Amino acid sequence: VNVPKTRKTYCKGKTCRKHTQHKVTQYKAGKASLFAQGKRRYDRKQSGFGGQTKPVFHKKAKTTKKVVLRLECVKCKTRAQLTLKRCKHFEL
Amino acid sequence: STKAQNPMRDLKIEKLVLNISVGESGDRLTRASKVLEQLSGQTPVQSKARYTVRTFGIRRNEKIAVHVTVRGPKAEEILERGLKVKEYQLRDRNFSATGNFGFGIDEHIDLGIKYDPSIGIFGMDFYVVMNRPGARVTRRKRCKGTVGNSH
Amino acid sequence: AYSSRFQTPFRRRREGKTDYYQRKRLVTQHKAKYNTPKYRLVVRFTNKDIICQIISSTITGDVVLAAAYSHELPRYGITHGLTNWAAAYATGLLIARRTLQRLGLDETYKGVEEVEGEYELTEAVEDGPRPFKVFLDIGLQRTTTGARVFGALKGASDGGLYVPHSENRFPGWDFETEEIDPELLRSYIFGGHVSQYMEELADDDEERFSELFKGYLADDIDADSLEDIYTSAHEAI
Amino acid sequence: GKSHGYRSRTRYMFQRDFRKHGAVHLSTYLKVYKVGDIVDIKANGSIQKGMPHKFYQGKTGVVYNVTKSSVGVIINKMVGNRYLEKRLNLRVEHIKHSKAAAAAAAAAAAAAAAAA
RNA sequence: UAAGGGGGGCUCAUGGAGAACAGAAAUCUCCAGUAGAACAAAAGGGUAAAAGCCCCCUUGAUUUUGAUUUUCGUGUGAAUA
RNA sequence: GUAAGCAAUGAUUAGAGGUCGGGGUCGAAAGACCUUGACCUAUUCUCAAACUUUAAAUAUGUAAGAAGUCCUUGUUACUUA
RNA sequence: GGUUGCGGCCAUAUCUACCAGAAAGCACCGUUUCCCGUCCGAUCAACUGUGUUAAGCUGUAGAGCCGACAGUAGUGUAGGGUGACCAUACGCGAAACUCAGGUGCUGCAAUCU
RNA sequence: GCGGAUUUAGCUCAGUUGGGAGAGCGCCAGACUGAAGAUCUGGAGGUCCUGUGUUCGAUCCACAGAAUUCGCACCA
């Protein structure tokens, strides 16, 4: 399935209320954080005693969970993502 | 009677369809459609197709040939153009059991077209049928207008 | 009947007049919309009259509560045949004002003017409003622009029994339309465009005036489409 | 062996009827209920949104009330655990009509004393 | 991203009967019949009031909620005015 | 759907009817004369867990009753105009 | 006395052979600048011509469909016997087969008599 | 987390930042030899990976994708 990568629709995050042009986009990436809970426990030496269970390798998930259709408003900065329906192969 | 008394159950007609078989198409569909248009003076239908078994490679889905359906007194004029001159080329009476009168005249050159607008040889159909059951009853409409019968 | 255990079809469906899809999403509201010809507030084409009613609660179906009639137009001052444009507008206005009953004056008595009760009115949104109002039903044929159904809807609306509407599928008053085969005469709503065709002339097959649908009438009783005929009904009601 | 859900075991309770096949007429469609109307139940795959459950057919029941309007309405019936307040949701078409005979016994009985 | 909403229009697959043609037929037509065709992918199942055929324009792949109930011990889930 | 059955669908036994096909014979290929196998249908007869037109006693659910509630007129507030 | 509509409502409401009526009311007959639509006159249109049409009714039994009286299988709760089965307490008891039967039921609206 | 090579006629491959491409082996046909080999002639076989651009003009330059191939970093 493909949702279009721009539609006009209702003003979802109701900063206008009345219907506007939205832009259907996706999020960013940047650094690696470093200060984050499992990263603080991992390279330290923790999980206490018991193995090398110091928060380990790949903590995973499956193929496509939901789809990233973020409806950015043209008035404010406001974001709306809903419960988005599924796809097996999407592109932006 | 035999339910046949009034002008309706004599026969006011439905349709007297003209067709041209298009066993070529591609570039040359413009031959068939423009020949229909030149005799009648009407917009042809680039046709539907029935759902049957897939002969050649494609049969159904593609708008393959071309016909033109016409009803009313508008149909009786184009009937006269095929009857009054084009029947008296090479044609004797054809009728099925239900009583379908077809036409199929390789002389496209007499009425309407010449050899100049054409690609090569071909004829054209005129399914000038009658909505009343049986070839005893269809032949009644054509014999009151007096067509060329082979006895 | 057919294969297995099987149901034979409904008689009125086979009879070729009663529909059932139209009978689903239409009746659910139960405000002021019924007529004996078909169902809901129908404006039919006929050779002559239409009945036009509203709902009434009875076991078998709807019964007459308030109503009018098309031959309750010579009531005012039309005296001709049974067939034109002007009668459709007039009978729509007549039933809308006649929220008494057929034997009555052009007054309210029952309860309704527009519908049963009053309700809310927001600003205009489409698709899903709260449509608690009157359907002016077509009945059978094609919803062609300019037709008698929509001409009767205009008379009905702000006349009393309120069916809402835009101005797209509708005739006007000045411009109706209208086709012609040759003889010689005219009738209309008011005057309009048929009296402009009267430079070339020739118009007729099918009687005139008083009730719904058919035309003009050829014999010289009134040769031009004048206002005086229609205004004897329209201003009088 | 079997999976659960739709048509398993009681296929007939999912199913329409062979005799009464086709689209459902305006009988139980327009017949909306209120307090204390005794009713029955049988489904089909004709009404899509608001189809009742198959296990909780077979059982009869009474309408509690119609809550607000027409859709989202309920029918009371026991489930075979023990006696407990259990119901079932559905919309109008699945609901039938039954024994309004029994309650008219009291009105028949009351024609007693004045025969003196 | 139309392979959605709304309006308007239509009833089949298929057979018989042949028509210059024809190769079953192409296209068409008279005559007869009507949910047996059509169904992402499997099996059941629905359906002509159409869930099939046909044509054009629309963007609801929607915000904020939920009476009253499904209902598993639960995690967790549905009908839902 | 036990019961009972071959409508529908499923698997095969019988009489015969008979288009076309197949075989035989005369014919240059082409054409002509005969005849053993078809639906249909009449007569005769078999028959099925994913095949069911019709459809108990008897046990069981769920509701209701044997153990007292039905109905008229007027007013107030919500829903509801 | 009749015509037309709304139904509710599906197989005792279904079909054929064949007859018969016309303007209270209904339906066919016949055709088109220009709106409006296309492949096509499916929106709209005078005196009149006419039962072609369709709703309906009479005449009618050919077929769907239909039925007593009578005959009868299984069997709970139990209770008596047998190798591949048969027979009973006790409460009810069909098709197949047949005397025979058969042209719906009910409510509502408009108009004339 | 980040970068390098390669894609050219069936197959083997020669070769290139703008005037738009090249030979063997094989395939076919005619010469030629006493014949097979050898070799000329004629037939040919590709818009240089693909979608879309820049330019007077594109194998060549650009944005972007397919796909064989190769390496460091990963967290520790």
Phi, psi values for residue D13, rounded to 5°: -75, -25
Q: What is the DSSP letter of C15?
A: T
- Beta-carbon separation of D19 and C7 below 8 A: yes
Contact by Cβ (8 Å): B73, B11: no
Residues of chain C contacting residue D21, judged by C-beta atoms under 8 Å apart: 6-7
- Beta-carbon separation of D19 and C5 below 8 A: yes
Please report the number of interchain residue pairs, chain C to chain D, with beta-carbon separation below 8 angstroms.
21
Chains in contact with D, where contact means 3 or more Cβ–Cβ distances below 8 Å, are C
Specify the resolution in Å: 8.9
Contact by Cβ (8 Å): A16, A64: no
Measuring from the CA of residue D20 to each C1' atom, give the nucleotide at the shortest distance.
G10
Contact by Cβ (8 Å): B149, B140: no
CB-based burial label for C94 (10 Å; 0-12, 13-18, 19+): buried
Distance CA C135, CA C34 (A): 9
Distance CA C219, CA C207 (A): 10
- Bridge partners of B67, per DSSP, are B19, B45
Distance in Å from G109's C1' to C220's CA comes to: 39
List Cβ neighbours of C186 (8 Å cut-off, separation of 6 or more). C194, C195, C197, C198, C203, C216, C223, C224, C225
List Cβ neighbours of D96 (8 Å cut-off, separation of 6 or more). D28, D39, D40, D41, D42
List Cβ neighbours of C50 (8 Å cut-off, separation of 6 or more). C35, C37, C42, C43, C44, C70, C91, C211, C212
Distance in Å from G57's C1' to C47's CA comes to: 24
Tell whether C24 lies on the interface with D, counting CB pairs under 8 A: yes
- Reported in sequence order, the residue ranges of chain B that DSSP labels E, i.e. its strands, are 17-20, 45-46, 66-68, 125-127
List Cβ neighbours of C202 (8 Å cut-off, separation of 6 or more). C180, C182, C183, C184
- Beta-carbon separation of C20 and D22 below 8 A: no
**What is the helix (H) or strand (E) element at residue D75, kind and residue range?**
strand D73-76
* DSSP string of A23-61, one letter each residue: EEE-----S--SSSHHHHHHTT--S-SSTT-SS-S----
Taking chain B, what is the end-to-end CA distance rounded to the nearest angstrom? Answer: 26
Cα dihedral value C153, C156, C161, C166, nearest 10: 40
From the list C13, C12, C102, C115, the residue with the least C-alpha distance to C49 is C102
Distance CA B93, CA B97 (A): 13
Chain H: nucleotides under 7 Å from a protein CB? 75-76
Please give the residue of chain D at the shortest CA–CA distance from C10: D25
Kindly determine whether the C-beta of residue D15 is less than 7 Å away from any atom of nucleic acid strand F.
no
Residue with tokens 């004029």: B77
Kindly determine whether the C-beta of residue C72 is less than 7 Å away from any atom of nucleic acid strand G.
no
- Strand pairing category for B17-20 and B125-127: antiparallel
Q: Is the four-CA dihedral C221, C224, C225, C231 of positive or negative sign?
A: negative
Residue with tokens 């923790």: A46
Kindly determine whether the C-beta of residue C120 is less than 7 Å away from any atom of nucleic acid strand F.
yes
Tell whether C23 lies on the interface with D, counting CB pairs under 8 A: yes
Residues of D with CB under 8 A from a CB of C: 18-23, 25-26, 29-30
- Beta-carbon separation of C24 and D22 below 8 A: no
Distance CA C174, CA C236 (A): 21
Chain F: nucleotides under 7 Å from a protein CB? 1, 7-8, 52-54, 61-66, 68-71, 80-81
> What are the CB-based long-range contacts (under 8 Å, 24+) for D49-52?
D49/D91, D50/D89, D50/D90, D50/D91, D50/D94, D51/D90, D51/D94, D52/D88, D52/D89, D52/D90, D52/D94
Query: Given its phi and psi angles, is residue B114 left (phi above 0), alpha (psi -120 to 50 degrees) or beta?
Result: beta
- Cis geometry, peptide bond prior to residue C178 (ω within 30 degrees of 0): yes
Distance in Å from F11's C1' to D4's CA comes to: 34
C42-74 burial string, b = 16+ CB within 10 Å, else e?
bbbbbebbbbbbbbeeeeeebebbbbbbbbbbe
**What is the helix (H) or strand (E) element at residue C51, kind and residue range?**
strand C51-53
Kindly determine whether the C-beta of residue A70 is less than 7 Å away from any atom of nucleic acid strand H.
no
Tell whether C11 lies on the interface with D, counting CB pairs under 8 A: no
Contact by Cβ (8 Å): D47, D92: no
Provide the CB-side half-sphere exposure for A45 (13 A, CA). Answer: 1
- Bridge partners of D76, per DSSP, are D62, D87
Using DSSP, state whether C188 is helix, strand or coil.
coil
Distance CA D31, CA A16 (A): 43
Query: What radius of gyration, in Å, describes the C-alpha atoms of chain C?
Result: 20
Kindly determine whether the C-beta of residue C26 is less than 7 Å away from any atom of nucleic acid strand G.
no
Q: Out of D18, D23, D26, whose CB is closest to C5?
A: D18
Using DSSP, state whether D50 is helix, strand or coil.
coil
Tell whether C27 lies on the interface with D, counting CB pairs under 8 A: yes
